């Protein structure tokens, strides 16, 4: 079969890409919280590093008791042990990406993994 | 020390996050091409799976001779062997994310990797 899979996601749709795109190196979740709302729980990871990318709006994320302000354009790496909990701003919703990957699994990349054709 | 790292990226800035955020499970590149422009070369990967997310605009991506139309909200998985080359539309720029991760490296995730804190 094809060396790729594609799908379209609505502007304000909440979905996970792993099963729909048959990912093998990560899980990607697209989500967003309305103003004044936030993830109702705190969590960490056993072996997965997590990368957050704020696509729109603004808000906060509490990591190990410390709350960090967030706005569109902000990107964060969170180690497995980090206890996290994101939430939207009081006067604004927030849209973000959560890339889950096995910590320390990356080897070569770009220069050391890409192959130019002819 | 801290269990996280943060940085801000300008709306139209082109950067790679691996070194700046000290990622260990992936490389994330944020890029965008002006109307009528495109990556000047074709490439594949030795062992990294690649996930593309179109954040804005529209364009095309040619994978193994087949060109696929792209627009904001589109997400794709590309296997290592896939020969790819993205470009913007003739009448519009395109902004996208390229998540590079080692293919088949993901094990548990979400339900099988997240840990809720009481
Ligand atoms: Zn690549
Ligand atoms: Zn998580």
UniProtKB/TrEMBL annotation, chains A, B:
Sorted alphabetically, which Pfam families does this protein's record hold? Cupin_2
Q: Which residues bind Zn(2+)?
A: 43, 45, 50
Give yes or no: UniProt keyword Metal-binding. Answer: yes
Q: Where is the signal peptide?
A: none
Under Gene Ontology molecular function, one entry of this record is: metal ion binding
Keywords from the named record: Metal-binding, Zinc
Checking Gene3D superfamilies in the record gives: Jelly Rolls
- The answer to whether UniProt assigns keyword rRNA-binding to this entry is no
What the entry lists under PANTHER family is as follows: CUPIN TYPE-2 DOMAIN-CONTAINING PROTEIN, OXALATE-BINDING PROTEIN
Task: Provide the protein name.
Answer: Uncharacterized protein
Q: What is the lineage of its organism?
A: Bacteria, Pseudomonadati, Bacteroidota, Bacteroidia, Bacteroidales
């Amino acid at each position: 079969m094809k060396n790729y899979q594609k799908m379209s996601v609505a502007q304000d749709a909440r979905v996970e890409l792993h099963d729909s795109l048959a990912l093998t190196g990560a899980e990607v979740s697209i989500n967003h919280l309305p103003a004044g709302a936030g993830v109702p729980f705190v969590h960490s990871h056993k072996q997965n590093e997590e990368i957050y990318g704020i696509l729109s709006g603004k808000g906060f994320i509490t990591i190990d008791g410390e709350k960090i302000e967030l706005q569109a354009g902000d990107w964060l790496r969170i180690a497995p042990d980090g206890k996290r909990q994101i939430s939207a701003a009081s006067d604004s919703p927030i849209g973000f990406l959560c890339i889950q990957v096995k910590a320390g699994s990356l080897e070569g990349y770009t220069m050391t993994d890409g192959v130019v054709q002819l």
